[PDB]
Design an enzyme around this catalytic site. Structure first.
Site, PDB file in Angstrom:
ATOM      1  CG  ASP A   7      -1.565   1.216   1.423  1.00 32.92           C
ATOM      2  OD1 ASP A   7      -2.373   1.723   0.181  1.00 32.92           O
ATOM      3  OD2 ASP A   7      -1.748   1.879   2.483  1.00 32.92           O
ATOM      4  CB  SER A   8       0.451   4.882  -0.583  1.00 38.32           C
ATOM      5  OG  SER A   8      -0.862   5.240   0.024  1.00 38.32           O
ATOM      6  CB  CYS A  53      -3.062   0.861  -2.861  1.00 35.76           C
ATOM      7  SG  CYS A  53      -3.440   2.760  -2.981  1.00 35.76           S
ATOM      8  CD  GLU A  97      -3.038   8.933   6.746  1.00 34.24           C
ATOM      9  OE1 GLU A  97      -2.200   9.974   6.728  1.00 34.24           O
ATOM     10  OE2 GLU A  97      -2.903   7.941   5.911  1.00 34.24           O
ATOM     11  CB  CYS A 146     -10.480   5.016  -0.412  1.00 32.71           C
ATOM     12  SG  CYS A 146      -9.084   5.577   0.263  1.00 32.71           S
ATOM     13  CG  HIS A 204      -7.161   5.841   4.480  1.00 33.60           C
ATOM     14  ND1 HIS A 204      -6.393   5.162   3.555  1.00 33.60           N
ATOM     15  CD2 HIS A 204      -6.338   6.579   5.336  1.00 33.60           C
ATOM     16  CE1 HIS A 204      -5.189   5.681   3.796  1.00 33.60           C
ATOM     17  NE2 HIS A 204      -5.190   6.579   5.073  1.00 33.60           N
TER      18      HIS A 204
END
Lengths: 256, 256, 256, 256
Positions: free
Chosen positions: C11-12, C74, C144, C175, C177
């Protein structure tokens, strides 16, 4: 599986054109993409692990272009990256180490010459027992200077091969450039079978691809050149090695 | 300005050690930080603009280590990066082109030998009028293979230098490696004054740093080696050229 | 095949840990390498072709660690790299786009939210017909910063979702997140099925790996974290989203 | 020095346009090169040493375009690269930290807001004693999404500035983007003087530039935009923040 799609061939530079020539002779109907990484040539003195990353980037670029197989024409990159590269990719991947080391197994005592990276990697000992191995850094710049028949070549051949076993029956030319030097090498090691990486590999490629139904039955094959350094310099260099470069464009390292 | 701080010297590899030695003889009380970019050697066949980015990257790394001056010991990088690099940076920056050309201006007919990039860069024509100029690609591998005292060196000098004008009074040795072939060059071209880039630059460096109050009047000098490729290969090559390499550490291209 | 080998997940950054946790539950015996590209986070604003090179680079890196399968956690990178990455590699490759789109085909009118890059790619329309798509750039930072239960998240969910069709039956959380924002999303979009990329993919990974005979049968599974940015920062960011990181080392972008 | 040469301004992205706007208002005849590194935005979560290589690389690029001065519009990049970048370069180099800290010395109890990297650099404490500092990660995306007049901007401003001392007399707006949030910030901290990095820096640049005799007296000022990410995405984002981008082109990171 699309037999109309091209075959990828890559090298650090112009040396791998000996492999290209042998491939085009056996397979005049195929389309080749020849990738010469002249922005980062030579590989022979770089750390093996760096070459392995080069090979991965370039394999990625060729797949992006749609190739149906990849031929690693460089002996240094073959040493660095194979067989893993073939074990990691779906399209057939061929190198210039194994075919010549296979043929070499029909002789009692076999020697190797190649770049510093090639002989120190142990790539060849994985496929064949070696009586002797020696790095010949000057051969490549002797060949690229067009001096393959000049007396200086001969003296340099003697400096590298003087100290080598007199009962050797065969010598592996484990560097793309070394076919140009059969004359000076034959002269210093008479009677010794000289194993050519280019011809041995192209045969393996042709056999295996036909075997998988991937050869293109119809049409007139072409070659496109892709280089990361200066195209005009590459074109000049390729010509000094007897190859008329028709189509070249510069590929950015950012595309890698 | 702090005279306890070190002098940066950088090159593509081992060749720039000729410059390092001349400097250490004149300035035994200076600390040198020698940076050999062996992961990307050679510069002599790369595009001149790519070398310009190399020079800027390394110049920045040396400024982050604290150097009080920079010596660009590579002729190719000097051609690629000077004079702008000296105009853009506050610390004194010296190269290996201008001092040798400056001395050359006191003879009527002047010739140049160097890498591919150097003779094509036009850097030397900027500073002195040239009668003749010839790239000598085999010379660098001849020196790195330890053959400068071998008769093949004598033969290679003839291949490159035969067809240069008989009325040359001086020849610029425009490559860090060429002082090693001073005998062979001197033999094939007797009478002509040979201009050594390393000796003439070290003098220019010492004179100017003195003029600015930047020399270190006390203490014993030390040299540290910083390279981007494999350190052990570097140490072997350096020792073949007469430098006992005491401290060497590998620097990532990520640090640049 | 070797069933003792680890599974690569990349993932990033920390978003891909939602996928990792779902994987952990279904496959507690498996050893995992989680690769978080935190030096280059985020992917959502970058060109899709740049991300595609990232995916290749990292895939090659995981293969050099010996992984037996790769999960692209991702959504932006799946959009950039799949299905080609799966078509090009020998090991099984799984993404987070196809499984959620498969489930979404049992609904009449389906919407998608995700990063700017994901929505522009058209990756999702290639698998399921979509009634609505909206980029939700602020959603990633809200997670985050730890604000998912906070009112400001709720107002931001409304700002992005106001003009969504009243007759939507399902919404793809495209996504990594967005599973943290289920509360705020359902409040603005009641009665709409929320399709979670992470839960569906781990099942597919588990089903597919079981079927290939690659599941590990003995052993306590750990996770090792590899990141391209500062490891401690990663450790602190992962904990704020509920993951306890034990083994984390920084991997240099030059190893890529 | 050449007064017809342009002034260079660089940032990670669109945030630096606040500094550009202030500059152009004071120096309307000057030609500007604005470099936005949108391939690598944001800087605020990266290692400070990596940002410092970025500053060096882009500074080299602008010098190769011929700028006569460089403005580092990013507060993160000033913190990473100044004062050293100004010491190591010949052209005048300006940042956004030092001018705002200088004005801040006219107050008893001073605060600072900015990115994670900026408060963790300790760059502001080298110039002014700080009573309070808070990183405000969400402010940048609030601005890039066009939400500075929205009530979440009031709620988010309140979230980050709540424990701030009620006796604070001044707050440094230590991020290029935060002038768009003057409204929310003043509302949530009434009576506090807001120090704007952009207006104060432009003054310093104009003051210093006239004094060096470097202002361009004749001419109609233009701006050219250079970005490393997608130029159309950059143009769209610049329009959302009120800058009309005439000329923009993409520069490859390999050009760096």
């Amino acid at each position: 599986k699309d037999p109309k799609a091209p075959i990828g061939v890559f090298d650090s530079g112009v040396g791998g054109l000996t492999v290209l020539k042998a491939l085009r002779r056996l397979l005049p109907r195929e389309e080749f993409l020849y990738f010469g990484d002249t922005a980062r040539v030579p590989y022979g003195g770089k750390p093996l692990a760096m070459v392995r990353r080069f090979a991965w980037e370039i394999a990625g670029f060729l797949l992006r272009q749609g190739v149906k197989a990849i031929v690693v024409a460089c002996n240094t990159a073959s040493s660095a990256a194979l067989p893993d590269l073939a074990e990691d990719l779906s399209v057939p991947v061929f190198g210039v180490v194994e075919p010549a080391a296979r043929a070499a197994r029909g002789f009692r005592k076999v020697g190797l010459i190649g770049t510093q990276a090639t002989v120190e990697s142990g790539a060849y000992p994985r496929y064949v027992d070696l009586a002797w191995a020696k790095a010949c850094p000057l051969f490549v710049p002797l060949v690229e200077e067009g001096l393959w028949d000049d007396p200086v070549a001969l003296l340099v051949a003697r400096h590298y091969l003087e100290d080598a076993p007199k009962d050797l029956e065969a010598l592996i030319l484990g560097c793309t450039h070394y076919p140009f030097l059969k004359g000076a090498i034959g002269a210093v090691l008479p009677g010794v079978a000289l194993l050519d990486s280019a011809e041995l590999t192209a045969q393996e490629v042709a056999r295996a691809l036909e075997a998988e139904g991937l050869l293109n039955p119809e049409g007139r094959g072409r070659t496109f050149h892709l280089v990361t350094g200066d195209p005009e310099a590459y074109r000049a260099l390729a010509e000094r090695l007897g190859e008329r470069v028709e189509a070249v464009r510069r590929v950015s390292l950012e595309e890698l």
